[PDB]
C-alpha cells in the first residue's frame, strides 16, 4: 500500500519511534507495512504489531461503550426523543472498529498464520485471531453474532491445544491466551462457570511450575497470574 516504498527495517524503526511518541495509529500503519513485505515476524516484531492494534482498537472499544450507554438511556421510558444522531454516531464508531478488526484478521489470514510453524508464533497468532473475533462479537447483534462467536472460540481452542502440548504452564503467551479465553467464556459466551474453571486450573498449574524459573521469568509469569487472580476475585 502506502508503505510499499519504505524499507522493512525503516518501518520497524519508525514503529518503535511511534510507540515512544504514543502515536498508535501511525505505529499500526508501519507494522501493517512491515507485515506486507511478506517475511515472517520475529518475537519483538510480533509484539510491536500486537501493541499497536491493541491501542487503536482499545480507543474505539472505549468510545463505543460510552456511546452505546447513551443510546440505551435514550431508549428508556420517560426519555425525550432527540432524533437519530446518537445511533448514527454509534454506528460510525462501530463501523471503524469493525474495519480495524477486519484489517488485523486479514493480515493473520494473509499470510501470518499459514507460515507460522513454531509453537510460540502459531499460538501468538491464533490468540490474536480469537481476540479480534471477540472484539467483533462485543458489537455484533444481527444474524452473524453466533458465527462470530464460533470463530472466536475455534481460534482460541486451537491455540489452547497447541499451547498445552508445546509450552510450559508458566509461559507468558500460554498464560495470556488462557486469561483471554476465560474472558471470552465469561463476557461473550455466557459461560461463567467455564471461565472460573479455566482461570483456576491455569493459575494452579503455573504455581506448581514457578520453581523452574529464573528471577526475570518468575516476574513475567507472576504478573499475568495476578490478572487471573483479580478476575477470580471479582467473579467469585
Amino acid at each position: 500500500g502506502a508503505m510499499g516504498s519504505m524499507e522493512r527495517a525503516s518501518l520497524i524503526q519508525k514503529a518503535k519511534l511511534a510507540e515512544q511518541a504514543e502515536r498508535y495509529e501511525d505505529m499500526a500503519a508501519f507494522m501493517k507495512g512491515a507485515v506486507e513485505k511478506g517475511e515472517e515476524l520475529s518475537c519483538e516484531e510480533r509484539n510491536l504489531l500486537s501493541v499497536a492494534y491493541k491501542n487503536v482498537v482499545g480507543g474505539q472499544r472505549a468510545a463505543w461503550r460510552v456511546l452505546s450507554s447513551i443510546e440505551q438511556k435514550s431508549n428508556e421510558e420517560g426519555s425525550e426523543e432527540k432524533g437519530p444522531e446518537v445511533r448514527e454516531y454509534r454506528e460510525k464508531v462501530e463501523t471503524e472498529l469493525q474495519g480495524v478488526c477486519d484489517t488485523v484478521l486479514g493480515l493473520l489470514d494473509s499470510h501470518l498464520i499459514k507460515e507460522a510453524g513454531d509453537a510460540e508464533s502459531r499460538v501468538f497468532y491464533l490468540k490474536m485471531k480469537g481476540d479480534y473475533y471477540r472484539y467483533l462479537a462485543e458489537v455484533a447483534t444481527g444474524d452473524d453474532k453466533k458465527r462470530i462467536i464460533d470463530s472466536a472460540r475455534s481460534a482460541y481452542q486451537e491455540a489452547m491445544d497447541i499451547s498445552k502440548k508445546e509450552m510450559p504452564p508458566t509461559n507468558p503467551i500460554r498464560l495470556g491466551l488462557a486469561l483471554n479465553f476465560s474472558v471470552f467464556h465469561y463476557e461473550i459466551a455466557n459461560s461463567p462457570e467455564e471461565a472460573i474453571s479455566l482461570a483456576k486450573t491455569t493459575f494452579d498449574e503455573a504455581m506448581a511450575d514457578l520453581h523452574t524459573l529464573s528471577e526475570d521469568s518468575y516476574k513475567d509469569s507472576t504478573l499475568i497470574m495476578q490478572l487471573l487472580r483479580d478476575n477470580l476475585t471479582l467473579w467469585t
Binding site: 486469561l179 483471554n180 474472558v183 483479580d230 478476575n231 471479582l234
Partner: peptide, 7 residues
C-alpha cells in the same frame, strides 16, 4: 473493579 484481559 471489572473483568480484565491481558495487558
Amino acid at each position: 473493579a471489572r473483568t480484565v484481559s491481558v495487558s
